[PDB]
Design a protein around this ligand. Structure first.
Ligand SMILES: Nc1ncnc2c1ncn2[C@@H]1O[C@H](COP(=O)(O)OP(=O)(O)OP(=O)(O)O)[C@@H](O)[C@H]1O
Ligand SMILES: Nc1ncnc2c1ncn2[C@@H]1O[C@H](COP(=O)(O)OP(=O)(O)OP(=O)(O)O)[C@@H](O)[C@H]1O
Ligand SMILES: Nc1ncnc2c1ncn2[C@@H]1O[C@H](COP(=O)(O)OP(=O)(O)OP(=O)(O)O)[C@@H](O)[C@H]1O
Ligand SMILES: Nc1ncnc2c1ncn2[C@@H]1O[C@H](COP(=O)(O)OP(=O)(O)O)[C@@H](O)[C@H]1O
Ligand SMILES: [Mg+2]
Ligand SMILES: [Mg+2]
Ligand SMILES: [Mg+2]
Ligand SMILES: [Mg+2]
Lengths: 248, 253, 239, 396, 143, 209, 407
C-alpha cells in the first residue's frame, strides 16, 4: 500500500494521502455559494447546535479575509484556523505592498500555493480543509472560488462541499439559473437546497448561517444575517413550499 | 419493494415459466440476482416469498455451509449442490450472506483465505464456466456489495444486481400496515404519522416498532394499541447512539 | 519493496518512484505541440467542462514569458507552482542578463527544478511533463518537452497526456515539410492532431498559436470553431 | 495409445433467420439420425459361444479387482486385495501373461483368489468425468475480436495437429502450455469452449478444484492420473480453468491442509516439466489473476505463451455487440455506436448482459423489437458492481 | 505436542516411553540420554522430574570453538603446515559444526579441482565461500 | 451488573431447553468448525423446541464487520454472518429465544442489533443508591451479620460500586471475619473490606489523573 | 410500473409475429436432441475386454485343476522364531493387516528354509507356512528407476559449466575415479541440492547426469512418497533406499524436494505429520550411494535436511551471464532453420536477468513468428520480435514515456 507518506507516488500515479484528505471533506460541514449577480452568498450549517453551546462568534463557519473578501471553511478546525490566519495575513500583506485590495484570485492562488507545498514536502500532513471564497474586485467583479485540500482551485457559479455535497451540487444544477440570479432568488435557492441537503427538516434559523457580499456605494459591505432575517427567509421558503402542494 | 419483486421475477419466474420468449427474442436467459442493501430491508424476506410461490426446487445455501475443515470438501459440496440442482431442474439456489464465501480474493500466503477461496472459484465456474448450466438460478443476498470480487459480481453470473434501499415514507407506511394487520388498532391511530416519525427505518425496524407498540399493551394487559403506544414505541426501537463527546464532534467544522 | 522511496535503486537500476511520476501525466488531458516555420501552435484536448464552473480559472496553456508559452499535463497542483517558478526565473534571468530567456534555457531551468525535487528523500517530484514551446530564440522556432524525472528533450512535434501514444503514432505519419509550409496548415495540423480526442467532440479543443516576435493568441471559440470546420471540409474529401 | 477420443458434435446449420433452409438442414440431420437409429435397432433385432462360456464359469461371479505386485512364477503371482492385504495367487491360462504388469489392476476369483483377468482402463471416475464428450456449441465465429489472442491459442493447440510439418521442418517444438489471464468476463473460458468446439483431440477439463482432495494421497495422485489419461489418449488438451485455486504462490505454511495444496501443485509442475518429458498433451490454463500464481507454474517451459485478454477495445466491443445481437430483432433506429463510444470499462460479459437486459426492457413495453432507448436503459440498469471509482479533478 | 486424528499411534509410543522413564528410579545403571534439534515442539511432559531432566545446552560454536572444530575434521587430510585456523574462525561466523566440517571437505575438493596435493589457506577460504553457496566475484568498485 | 446472573436465573426458571454457549467457544480453529458449531447450536435448539440460547460475551465474535484482509478476521466475520443467518434468515426458527450478553454494546454489528434479531436491547447500568440497598439485602440475607452492622451507612456512600463489587464487599468481609476465627461478621470487618474493594485505582501513575 | 405479463399478453407474444417455420424448426431441434440422447443410450456401453489370452494358449482342463487343487496363500512375514525345542520352532508370523499369529510349518516345506524376517506364505485356514517367498520388490519403486536413458547430453546444458563441474565432481567423478578422493583423504560429498530460480537448468542437469551415469539412476516422483494410508511413505522411502543399496553405484534424484521436505512444525491433528514423518525417515536413511535433490525454493526446506551432513554440497543455479546466454541460444538454435548470420551475442544482451528456459522460449517464438508469415528461414528480425514479446512483454513495464530517462 502507498498511503504511508504524503510524498509517495502510487504505481498508478495517484497521491493516496492527498485523496484521503480530499474524501475526508465529506465529514466537513455544508457550505454552498449560489449564483448571483450584484451579490453573492455562502450558506453554512451548524452541526454542533447543542443548547449548552453559548454563541459568541456568530461566524464560526464564516470568516472575513479582506475588506472585500469573505470565506467559509470545511475541514479540520485547527487547519481551518491556521489557513484563515494565513489568508488574512497574505491579504493584508498585499494591501500593504500594493495599496490595493487583493484581486480575489491571487489570494486564492496564494492559499493554494501554500497548501500544495504541504503535499510535496515530507513530514507535513496535507491541509485537510476545503473552503469557498467570495469577493469583489475591479477586474471581474463578484466571484466564487472553490478551494480544495490538494491545492487545486477553480472558478464556480454554484457549488457546495461537506456532508451531502453531491446532492447539494446536483440540486443546484437542477434549478441552475444563469444571468437571472438576483440576490433574493439566490437566497431562496440557498434555503431551498439547505432544506434537503441537511437531514434535519424545517430548516431551523439558529442552525443555518447565510453570509452575503454586496457592492453598496463602493464599500463592499459583507453581511451575516441575524436570527430575525434568517427566520423571515425560512418563513418565505415555507410559504412558497405550501403553494407547491396544490398539484395533488 | 414492488419494483424489486417485479425485477426479481424477470430472472426467477419468467425465464423458467416461459423460456420461449427468450429464445424467440434471441437473448440468453438471465441467471443470477444479487439482493444487496442495508440490513432489515427484505433481501431474505423476498427469498422466502419467492420460495413460497416458485414450483421449482428451491435450494437454500446460507452463510458458511460450504466452508469445511477438510481441503477440497467445500468445492466437492458445491459440485454436488449443482449436480442435485440439475437433476431436479428447474431449481433455484438462494445463498444468503454471500460475504461468508464470496469475499474479494486475497493474496495467497500466511494471512489470507485460500480454501473458502477455492470453493468460491468452483462456484464461479459452476455459474459461468466451461459447462453451461440450464434452468439454474441464484439469488444470493448480501449487505456489503464492495467486498465481493469483480469475478463473482461480473455479468453472466449476476445479470441483475437489485438494490434494497431503506423504505421511503409511502413505503414505511406500507410496512406499518402489513405488520399491523393482525393488530387490534384503535380509532384515530394515524399510521402515516408514525411512519413520518421514522426517517430511514430499515424496514425491520418498522416491524420492531409494531412489536414494541404491542408489548406496551402486553405489560398493561390489554388488546388495543393507541397512538401514544406507537409514538412511545418509535423512540424505543428507533434509538440512536450519539458521539457523546463534543471534542470529537468538533474535530470537523 | 523497491518503490516506497525515491532515493532507492532497484536491483536492475530503476528509480521506481521516478517512473511512477510519469504515470500522473498519462492520466492528464492530451496536450499536443508542433513547431512550424513561423507559427508554433500548441493545443490541448479534453476540456471536460463541469457545466457549472467558469473556464478562466481552468487555463492550462500559460505564457512563462512574453515570447515563450508552455502547456502541461498531469496534476494541476504542481503545474501552478512550476508556472510561478518559471515565470519568476525568466524575469530574474532578464534582470541579471539583459537578453531575455531562450526556450532551451527555460526548459533547462524547469528540468533542473524538477531534478532537484527528484534527487532527495522527503520531497515528491513534480508530477507533470510540460511542453515548452516558444519563439524567443530570435529567428529559429523551437519546442521542448520536460519530464517529471528531470529530462528535457527537443521535438519537432510532441504529444503528452492521456492519448500520448495514439496521437504521437498518428502524428509521425502526417508530419512532413509540406504540412508545415503554411501557418494555417500548421495550425490545422494541431486541429487534426487533437481531433483524435477521447470522444472526438471537436468543441473541447483549445489551441494557442504564437508567431515570430508576436504575442500569444489563445484562439477564441469562433476562430477555433472556424478552423475545425475548415479541417472537416478538408476531411470531407474522403467522400 | 487408444487414439484421440474427440467429442461428438452434430453438424451445424447456419441459417439463423429461422428460414426454410434451416428446417431443411435440420431435417436432413434428423433423417440421418433416424437412419442410424434404424440401422442399430434393426441390427439388434435382425441378429439372432462354447469357448468363452467355460472361461466365464471358471471366473465366476463376482470378480474382485486387485493390484498386482509381483510375478513370482509364470503361473504364480502376488496380488493385493482391495483392502490392503496380500495373497499368493495362481495365474490362470486364459490370463494373458504379457499385459500382466506390476501395479496394474488384475481380476481375482472371489472364492479361490487367483488372477483371472486384467482390468485396463481403470481410470478413477473423478477423471473419466473430466473428459468432454459433448462438445460446446461455441465456434470461433461466436467470438468478436480477439484475433491476436485467438491466433496465439490456435498455433499451440490446433495448428501443431493440422500442420505439424510447419513446426518440424523448422526445428521447433510447438508451444505446449498457454495461460489465459485478464479481467473477469473477457473471453478466456469462451476461448476454451471455442477450441473444444474445433479440436480433433480429447479435451479434458478441470476447474483446478476437482484435482484437490481431502485425502493425503488422493490430491497429487488425481493429477497424475489425469495426465496419464491425457498421454494415453493420443493428442490431448487439458483445460485447467481458475488455476488460482491450486497454483498460488508457494510459502512456508504452518497448516497441513495448505501444505498439501502446494504438494499437488508441485505435481502439476512435475507433470508439466519434470525429469520425464511430457507427451503430445497441451495444457490450457485460465486465471483472473496472473500476479498471484507461482513463478514456477507460469515459468516458460511449462507455460510457453501468456495470452493476455485486456478489456475489449472500441472495435472489439462493436464486434462483440454484433455477435451478441445477431439473433436479436433490432429496430431501424438502433445505432449501437452510442453505447460503444462510452469510456466505461465494458467487458464482453457486460455486452451480453446489456443485450439480455435490452431485450427484457422490450418485454416490459410489450415489444419483441428492441429500440435504441431499451439499450440506453439496460446500460444503466446493468452497469452496477463497478459504480464510479476514480481520482477527483486533481489532474488536468 | 498433543493434538480422532491419525497421530494417536505415536502418542501411545510417547506415553509408553514416559511410563518407562518414570517407572525406573535413579541410582541404577540405566542412565538415559536423548537428542533433538527442536525442543520448541517437544511436549514438556517429557521434560519433567523423573523423566529426562538435566537439559544439556548445545550452542553454536564460538570463534575458538569453530577453529578447533575445523582443526579436527582436517587431521585425515594433507593440510598445508601454514594454515591459520584462527583466521579461518574469524572468517567463519554463524557456522555450525557440520558446516565447520563441510568447509574442510569443500577446501579439499577445491584443492583437487586446482590439482594440488596440500590444502593452502586460499583453498580453505574458497571452501568457506562455497559452503554457503556464495560465489566470489572481484568487484571493480573496491580496488 | 447481573447480566450473566439474570441468564442463570432464567435457566433455573425455564421450562424450555437452555443452551449456553460462550462467545469464545465459537472461535475454534480448523475453519468451518466455528460456523458449523453455530449451525449445531441452532439446530440443537430446533429439535428440542422450545429452547433458549444464551450466548455470553458476544463482543468477541460479533464486532462490527469490516474489510478483512486475512483469514483471521474473515473467519470471525464468517461466524458473525452465520449468527446473523441462523438468528434471522431463510429458515425462521420458532420457539427459539436468544439471550445475548455483551459489555460494549457499540462495537456490535448493526445487522446484529436489528429489531428482527436482537429485539430488546436491555441496558444493565451500575446500581444506584436504591438498587445497591436491594443487592446488599439479598446478599447479606444468608450471611450471619451482627445487629450492629447497619447496611445503610455503606449503601449511602457515593462510590459507584457495581453489583460484583457489592458481592465482593460482602464475601471479603465474611472472609475477614473468618480469618479472626469469628463466626459473626462485625461492622469493623465491613468497613475494612469496604476500603479494599473501592480502592481500585491503587497503582495508577499520578500523571493521568 | 413494470406491469406483469398476464396470460393474454403471453399468448400474443408467443404467437403474434412468429415465423411460420418457428414451431416446426423448434420441434425438429428437440426431436434431434432426444434422438441423440436415445441413440447414444443404445450404444454407449462399449466393450472393455479383460485381457484374455488368445485361445491357442489356453489350458482350461488344467486351468480347472489349478483352480481346485492349488489354494490361495496369504503373504506373511516371519517376525520371530521361537525355537521352543529346536524341533517345533513355533514361528510367529505377521499377516500385515489381519493380525500376528504363532504358527508352524506345513510338512511340505523344510525347517531350515524359513529364516527370520523373510517373507513367508501361509494358508487361509491354519496359517501354516507352505512356501518361501522372495524378498518384496515394490511394484512402484521398481518403476521409479529410469530404465530408458534420457536423450539430452551434457553438451545441451550451456551457461552452467562451473555448476556442471561441481555436480560432476560429486555425482560422476567419485563413482568412476575413486582414487583422487582417497589419496587426499577427502570424503566425497554424498549429496547435492541444486537450487536456483525456476528455469535455470536444475532438472536439465539431472537428465544430463542420467544420460552419462554408468550407474543405476532413480527418479523420485515425490507424489508417490505421500500415500493416503499412514506410514506408507516411510515404507516407500525405506524400500527405495534398500533397493538402491542392493544395486551397485545407485543414484537417487528427489526432484521437487519441497513436496516431501517442508519445514517441520507440529500438526498432529491431521495428516501433515505423516509426510513429516516420511521426511524424518528419509533424513534417517540419508544420515556407494549418491543423492540428488532439486528445488526452486530452498528456503522452505528443513534446516536439518539442508545441513552439510545430508547435503554436503549446495550448487546454486544462478541466471546465466552473457557468455552463457549466447551458449544457451546456440544450443537451442542448433536444430532451428535459422539464417547463418544470426548475432546470438546481440540477442543475449537483449535478455538481461533471463533464465535458460526463457531463451528456449525466445528461440521457439522466433520460429513461431517465421511461421506466422510463410518464411522457411527464421531471420534475425523475427528473433528481435520474439524477444520483444517473450522477455520485454513480461519482464517489467519500462515503457517509452518513462524510459526517456536512460540514454
Ligand atoms: N420491505 C419489507 N416489507 C415487509 N416486511 C419487511 C420488509 N423489510 C423487512 N421486513 C421485516 O423485517 C424482517 C427482517 O428480515 P429480513 O430477511 O428482511 O432481513 P435482511 O436484513 O434483509 O436480511 P438478512 O437476514 O439476510 O440479513 C423480515 O423478516 C420482515 O418481517
Ligand atoms: N470477445 C468476445 N466475443 C463474444 N462474447 C464474448 C467475448 N468476450 C466475452 N464474451 C462473453 O462473455 C461471457 C462471459 O463468459 P466468459 O467465458 O467470457 O468468461 P471469463 O472471462 O472466462 O470469466 P472469469 O474471469 O469469471 O472466469 C461469455 O458468455 C461470452 O458470451
Ligand atoms: N543452462 C541451460 N542451457 C540450456 N538450456 C537450458 C538451460 N537451463 C534451462 N534450459 C532449458 O530450459 C528448460 C527448463 O526446464 P528445466 O527442467 O531445466 O527447469 P528447472 O530449472 O529444473 O525448473 P523448475 O525450478 O521449475 O523445476 C530445459 O528443459 C532446457 O531446455
Ligand atoms: N443484583 C445483584 N444481586 C446480587 N449479586 C449481584 C447482582 N448483580 C451482580 N451481582 C454479582 O456480580 C457477579 C457478576 O455476575 P454478573 O454481573 O451476572 O456477570 P457479568 O459480570 O458478566 O455481567 C455475580 O457473582 C453476582 O453475585
Ligand atoms: Mg438472509
Ligand atoms: Mg472463466
Ligand atoms: Mg457475563
Ligand atoms: Mg525442475
Amino acid at each position: 500500500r502507498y498511503d504511508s507518506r504524503t510524498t509517495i507516488f502510487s504505481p498508478e500515479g495517484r497521491l493516496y494521502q492527498v485523496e484521503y484528505a480530499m474524501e475526508a471533506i465529506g465529514h466537513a460541514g455544508t457550505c454552498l455559494g449560489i449564483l448571483a449577480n450584484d451579490g453573492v452568498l455562502l450558506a453554512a450549517e451548524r452541526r454542533n447546535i447543542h443548547k449548552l453551546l453559548d454563541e459568541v462568534f456568530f461566524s464560526e463557519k464564516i470568516y472575513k479575509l479582506n475588506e472585500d473578501m469573505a470565506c467559509s471553511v470545511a475541514g479540520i478546525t485547527s487547519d481551518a484556523n491556521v489557513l484563515t490566519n494565513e489568508l488574512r495575513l497574505i491579504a493584508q500583506r498585499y494591501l500593504l505592498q500594493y495599496q490595493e485590495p487583493i484581486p480575489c484570485e491571487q489570494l486564492v492562488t496564494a492559499l493554494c500555493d501554500i497548501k500544495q507545498a504541504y503535499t510535496q514536502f515530507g513530514g507535513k500532513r496535507p491541509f485537510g480543509v476545503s473552503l469557498l471564497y467570495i469577493g469583489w474586485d475591479k477586474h471581474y467583479g463578484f466571484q466564487l472560488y472553490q478551494s480544495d485540500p490538494s491545492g487545486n482551485y477553480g472558478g464556480w457559479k454554484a457549488t457546495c462541499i461537506g456532508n451531502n455535497s453531491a446532492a447539494a451540487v446536483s440540486m443546484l444544477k437542477q434549478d441552475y439559473k444563469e444571468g437571472e440570479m438576483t440576490l433574493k432568488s439566490a437566497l431562496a435557492l440557498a434555503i431551498k437546497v439547505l432544506n434537503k441537503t441537511m437531514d434535519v427538516s424545517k430548516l431551523s434559523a439558529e442552525k443555518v448561517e447565510i453570509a452575503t457580499l454586496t457592492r453598496e456605494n463602493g464599500k463592499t459591505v459583507i453581511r451575516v444575517l441575524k436570527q430575525k432575517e434568517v427566520e423571515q427567509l425560512i418563513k418565505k421558503h415555507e410559504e412558497e413550499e405550501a403553494k407547491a402542494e396544490r398539484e395533488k | 419493494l414492488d419494483k424489486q419483486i417485479k425485477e426479481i421475477k424477470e430472472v426467477i419466474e419468467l425465464p423458467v415459466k416461459h423460456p420461449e420468449l427468450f429464445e424467440a427474442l434471441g437473448i440468453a436467459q438471465p441467471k443470477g440476482v444479487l439482493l444487496y442493501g442495508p440490513p432489515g430491508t427484505g433481501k431474505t424476506l423476498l427469498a422466502r416469498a419467492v420460495a413460497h410461490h416458485t414450483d421449482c426446487t428451491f435450494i437454500r445455501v446460507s452463510g458458511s455451509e460450504l466452508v469445511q475443515k477438510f481441503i477440497g470438501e467445500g468445492a466437492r459440496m458445491v459440485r454436488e449442490l449443482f449436480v442435485m440442482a440439475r437433476e431436479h431442474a428447474p431449481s433455484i439456489i438462494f445463498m444468503d450472506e454471500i460475504d461468508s464465501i464470496g469475499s474479494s480474493r486475497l493474496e495467497g500466503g500466511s494471512g489470507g483465505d485460500s480454501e473458502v477461496q477455492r470453493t468460491m472459484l468452483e462456484l464461479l465456474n459452476q455459474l459461468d464456466g466451461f459447462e453451461a448450466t440450464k434452468n439454474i438460478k441464484v439469488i444470493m443476498a448480501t449487505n456489503r456489495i464492495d467486498i465481493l470480487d469483480s469475478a463473482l459480481l461480473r455479468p453472466g453470473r449476476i445479470d441483475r444486481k437489485i438494490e434494497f434501499p431503506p423504505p421511503n415514507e409511502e413505503a414505511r407506511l406500507d410496512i406499518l400496515k402489513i405488520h399491523s394487520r393482525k393488530m387490534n388498532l384503535t380509532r384515530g391511530i394515524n399510521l402515516r404519522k408514525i411512519a413520518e416519525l421514522m426517517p430511514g427505518a430499515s424496514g425491520a425496524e418498522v416491524k420492531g416498532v409494531c412489536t414494541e407498540a404491542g408489548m406496551y399493551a402486553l405489560r398493561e394487559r390489554r388488546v388495543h394499541v393507541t397512538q401514544e403506544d406507537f409514538e412511545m414505541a418509535v423512540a424505543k426501537v428507533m434509538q440512536k447512539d450519539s458521539e457523546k463527546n463534543m471534542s470529537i464532534k468538533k474535530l470537523w467544522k | 519493496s523497491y518503490d516506497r522511496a525515491i532515493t532507492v535503486f532497484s536491483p536492475d537500476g530503476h528509480l521506481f518512484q521516478v517512473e511512477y511520476a510519469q504515470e500522473a501525466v498519462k492520466k492528464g488531458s492530451t496536450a499536443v505541440g508542433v513547431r512550424g516555420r513561423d507559427i508554433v501552435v500548441l493545443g490541448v484536448e479534453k476540456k471536460s467542462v463541469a457545466k457549472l464552473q467558469d473556464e478562466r480559472t481552468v487555463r492550462k496553456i500559460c505564457a512563462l514569458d512574453d515570447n515563450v508559452c508552455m502547456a502541461f499535463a498531469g496534476l494541476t497542483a504542481d503545474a501552478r507552482i512550476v508556472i510561478n517558478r518559471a515565470r519568476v526565473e525568466c524575469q530574474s534571468h532578464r534582470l541579471t542578463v539583459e537578453d531575455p530567456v531562450t526556450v532551451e534555457y527555460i526548459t533547462r531551468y524547469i528540468a533542473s527544478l524538477k531534478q532537484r525535487y527528484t534527487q532527495s528523500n522527503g520531497r515528491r517530484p513534480f508530477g507533470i511533463s510540460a511542453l515548452i514551446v516558444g519563439f524567443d530564440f530570435d529567428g529559429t522556432p523551437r519546442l521542448y518537452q520536460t519530464d517529471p524525472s528531470g529530462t528535457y528533450h527537443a521535438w519537432k512535434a510532441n504529444a503528452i497526456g492521456r492519448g500520448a501514444k495514439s496521437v504521437r503514432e498518428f502524428l509521425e505519419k502526417n508530419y512532413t515539410d509540406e504540412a508545415i509550409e503554411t501557418d494555417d496548415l500548421t495550425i490545422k495540423l494541431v486541429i487534426k492532431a487533437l481531433l483524435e480526442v477521447v470522444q472526438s467532440g471537436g468543441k473541447n479543443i483549445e489551441l494557442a498559436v504564437m508567431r515570430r516576435d508576436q504575442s500569444l493568441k489563445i484562439l477564441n471559440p469562433e476562430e477555433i470553431e472556424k478552423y475545425v470546420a475548415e479541417i472537416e471540409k478538408e476531411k470531407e474529401e474522403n467522400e | 495409445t487408444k487414439g484421440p477420443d474427440a467429442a461428438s458434435k452434430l453438424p451445424l446449420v447456419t441459417p439463423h433467420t429461422q428460414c426454410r433452409l434451416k428446417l431443411l438442414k435440420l431435417e436432413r440431420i434428423k433423417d440421418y439420425l433416424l437412419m442410424e437409429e434404424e440401422f442399430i435397432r434393426n441390427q439388434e433385432q435382425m441378429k439372432p459361444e462354447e469357448e468363452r462360456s467355460k472361461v466365464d464359469d471358471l471366473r465366476g461371479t463376482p470378480m474382485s479387482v486387485g493390484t498386482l505386485e509381483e510375478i513370482i512364477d509364470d503361473n504364480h503371482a502376488i496380488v493385493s486385495t482391495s483392502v490392503g492385504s496380500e495373497h499368493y495367487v495362481s495365474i490362470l491360462s486364459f490370463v494373458d501373461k504379457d499385459l500382466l504388469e506390476p501395479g496394474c489392476s488384475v481380476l481375482l476369483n472371489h472364492k479361490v483368489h487367483a488372477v483371472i483377468g486384467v482390468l485396463m482402463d481403470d481410470t478413477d471416475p473423478l477423471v473419466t468425468v473430466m473428459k468432454v464428450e459433448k462438445a460446446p456449441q461455441e465456434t470461433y465465429a461466436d467470438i468478436g475480436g480477439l484475433d491476436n489472442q485467438i491466433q496465439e491459442i490456435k498455433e499451440s493447440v490446433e495448428l501443431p495437429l493440422t500442420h505439424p510439418e510447419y513446426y518440424e521442418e523448422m526445428g521447433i517444438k510447438p508451444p505446449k502450455g498457454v495461460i489465459l489471464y485478464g479481467p473477469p468476463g473477457t473471453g478466456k473460458t469462451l476461448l476454451a469452449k471455442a477450441v473444444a468446439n474445433q479440436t480433433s483431440a480429447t479435451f479434458l477439463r478441470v476447474v483446478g478444484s476437482e484435482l484437490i482432495q481431502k485425502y493425503l494421497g488422493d490430491g497429487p495422485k488425481l493429477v497424475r492420473e489425469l495426465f496419464r489419461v491425457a498421454e494415453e489418449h493420443a493428442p490431448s488438451i487439458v483445460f485447467i480453468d481458475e488455476i488460482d485455486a491450486i497454483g498460488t504462490k508457494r510459502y512456508d505454511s504452518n497448516s497441513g491442509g495448505e501444505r498439501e495444496i502446494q504438494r499437488t501443485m508441485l505435481e502439476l509442475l512435475n507433470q508439466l516439466d519434470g525429469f520425464d518429458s511430457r507427451g503430445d498433451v497441451k495444457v490450457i490454463m485460465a486465471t483472473n489473476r496472473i500476479e498471484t500464481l507461482d513463478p514456477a507454474l507460469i515459468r516458460p517451459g511449462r507455460i510457453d505463451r501468456k495470452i493476455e485478454f485486456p478489456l475489449p477495445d472500441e472495435k472489439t466491443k462493436k464486434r462483440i455487440f454484433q455477435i451478441h445481437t445477431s439473433r436479436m430483432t433490432l429496430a431501424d433506429d438502433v445505432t449501437l455506436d452510442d453505447l460503444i463510444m462510452a469510456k466505461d470499462d465494458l467487458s464482453g460479459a457486460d455486452i451480453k448482459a446489456i443485450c439480455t437486459e435490452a431485450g427484457l426492457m422490450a418485454l416490459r413495453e410489450r415489444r419483441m423489437k428492441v429500440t435504441n432507448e431499451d439499450f440506453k436503459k439496460s446500460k444503466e440498469n446493468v452497469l452496477y458492481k463497478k459504480q464510479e471509482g476514480t481520482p477527483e479533478g486533481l489532474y488536468l | 505436542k498433543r493434538f480422532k486424528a491419525g497421530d494417536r499411534e505415536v502418542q501411545r509410543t510417547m506415553l509408553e516411553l514416559l511410563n518407562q522413564l518414570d517407572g525406573f528410579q535413579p541410582n541404577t545403571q540405566v542412565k538415559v540420554i536423548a537428542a533433538t534439534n527442536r525442543v520448541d515442539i517437544l511436549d514438556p511432559a517429557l521434560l519433567r522430574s523423573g523423566r529426562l531432566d538435566r537439559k544439556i545446552e548445545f550452542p553454536m560454536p564460538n570463534e575458538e570453538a569453530r577453529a578447533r572444530i575445523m582443526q579436527i575434521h582436517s587431521r585425515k587430510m594433507n593440510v598445508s603446515p601454514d594454515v591459520n585456523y584462527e583466521e579461518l574462525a574469524r572468517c567463519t561466523d554463524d557456522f555450525n559444526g557440520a558446516q565447520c566440517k563441510a568447509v574442510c571437505v569443500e577446501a579439499g575438493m577445491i584443492a583437487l579441482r586446482r590439482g594440488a596435493t596440500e590444502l593452502t589457506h586460499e583453498d580453505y577460504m574458497e571452501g568457506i565461500l562455497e559452503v554457503q553457496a556464495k560465489k566470489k566475484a572481484n568487484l571493480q568498485y573496491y580496488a | 451488573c447481573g447480566k450473566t446472573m439474570l441468564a442463570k436465573a432464567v435457566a433455573h426458571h425455564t421450562t424450555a431447553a437452555f443452551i449456553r454457549v460462550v462467545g469464545s467457544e465459537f472461535v475454534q480453529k480448523y475453519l468451518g468448525e466455528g460456523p458449523r458449531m453455530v449451525r449445531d447450536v441452532f439446530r440443537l435448539a430446533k429439535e428440542n423446541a422450545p429452547a433458549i440460547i444464551f450466548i455470553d460475551e458476544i463482543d468477541a465474535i460479533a464486532t462490527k464487520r469490516f474489510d478483512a484482509q486475512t483469514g483471521a478476521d474473515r473467519e470471525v466475520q464468517r461466524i458473525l454472518l452465520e449468527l446473523l443467518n441462523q438468528m434471522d434468515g431463510f429458515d425462521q426458527n420458532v420457539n427459539v429465544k436468544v439471550i445475548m450478553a455483551t459489555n460494549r454494546a457499540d462495537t456490535l454489528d448493526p445487522a446484529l442489533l436489528r429489531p428482527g434479531r436482537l429485539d430488546r436491547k436491555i441496558e444493565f447500568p451500575l446500581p444506584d443508591r436504591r438498587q445497591k440497598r436491594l443487592i446488599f439485602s439479598t446478599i447479606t440475607s444468608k450471611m450471619n451479620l451482627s445487629e450492629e452492622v447497619d447496611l445503610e451507612d455503606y449503601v449511602a456512600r457515593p462510590d459507584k460500586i457495581s453489583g460484583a463489587d457489592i458481592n465482593s464487599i460482602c464475601q471479603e468481609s465474611g472472609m475477614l471475619a473468618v480469618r479472626e476465627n469469628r463466626y459473626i461478621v462485625l461492622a469493623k470487618d465491613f468497613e475494612k473490606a469496604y476500603k479494599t474493594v473501592i480502592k481500585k485505582d491503587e497503582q495508577e501513575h499520578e500523571f493521568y489523573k | 410500473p413494470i406491469r406483469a405479463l398476464d396470460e393474454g399478453d403471453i399468448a400474443l407474444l408467443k404467437t403474434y409475429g412468429q415465423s411460420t417455420y418457428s414451431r416446426q424448426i423448434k420441434q425438429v431441434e428437440d426431436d434431434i436432441q432426444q434422438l441423440l440422447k436415445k441413440i447414444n443410450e443404445l450404444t454407449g456401453i462399449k466393450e472393455s475386454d479383460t485381457g484374455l489370452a488368445p485361445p491357442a494358449l489356453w489350458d482350461l482342463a488344467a486351468d480347472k485343476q489349478t483352480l481346485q487343487s492349488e489354494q490361495p496363500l496369504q503373504v506373511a512375514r516371519c517376525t520371530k522364531i521361537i525355537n521352543a525345542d529346536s524341533e517345533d520352532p513355533k514361528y510367529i508370523i505377521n499377516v500385515k493387516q489381519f493380525a500376528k499369529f504363532v504358527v508352524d510349518l506345513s510338512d511340505q516345506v523344510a525347517p531350515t528354509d524359513i529364516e527370520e524376517g523373510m517373507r513367508v506364505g501361509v494358508d487361509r485356514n491354519k496359517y501354516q507356512i507352505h512356501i518361501p517367498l522372495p524378498p518384496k520388490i515394490d511394484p512402484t519403486v521398481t518403476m521409479m528407476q529410469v530404465e530408458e536413458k534420457p536423450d539430452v547430453t551434457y553438451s545441451d546444458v550451456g551457461g552452467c559449466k562451473e555448476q556442471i563441474e561441481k555436480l560432476r565432481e560429486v555425482v560422476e567423478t567419485p563413482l568412476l575415479h575413486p582414487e583422487r578422493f582417497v589419496n587426499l583423504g577427502i570424503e566425497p560429498p554424498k549429496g547435492v541440492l541444486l537450487f536456483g530460480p525456476p528455469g535455470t537448468g536444475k532438472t536439465l542437469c539431472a537428465r544430463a547426469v542420467a544420460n552419462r551415469t554408468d550407474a543405476c539412476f532413480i527418479r523420485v516422483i515425490g507424489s508417490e512418497l505421500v500415500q493416503k494410508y499412514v506410514g506408507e511413505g516411510a515404507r516407500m522411502v525405506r524400500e527405495l533406499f534398500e533397493m538402491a543399496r542392493t544395486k551397485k553405484a545407485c543414484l537417487i534424484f528427489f526432484d521437487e524436494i519441497d513436496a516431501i521436505g517442508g519445514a517441520r512444525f507440529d500438526d498432529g491433528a491431521g495428516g501433515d505429520n505423516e509426510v513429516q514423518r516420511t521426511m524424518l525417515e528419509l533424513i534417517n536413511q540419508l544420515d556407494n550411494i549418491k543423492v540428488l535433490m532439486a528445488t526452486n525454493r530452498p528456503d522452505t526446506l528443513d534446516p536439518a535436511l539442508m545441513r552439510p551432513g545430508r547435503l554436503d554440497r549446495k550448487i546454486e543455479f544462478s541466471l546465466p551471464d552473457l557468455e552463457g546466454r549466447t551458449h544457451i541460444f546456440k544450443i537451442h538454435a542448433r536444430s532451428m532453420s535459422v539464417e547463418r548470420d544470426i548475432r546470438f551475442e546481440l540477442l543475449a544482451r537483449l535478455c538481461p536477468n533471463s533464465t535458460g528456459a526463457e531463451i528456449r522460449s525466445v528461440c521457439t517464438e522466433a520460429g513461431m513468428f517465421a511461421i506466422r508469415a510463410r518464411r522457411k528461414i527464421a531471420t534475425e528480425k523475427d528473433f528481435l520480435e520474439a524477444v520483444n514479446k517473450v522477455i520485454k512483454s513480461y519482464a517489467k513495464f519500462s515503457a517509452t514515456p518513462r524510459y526517456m530517462t536512460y540514454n
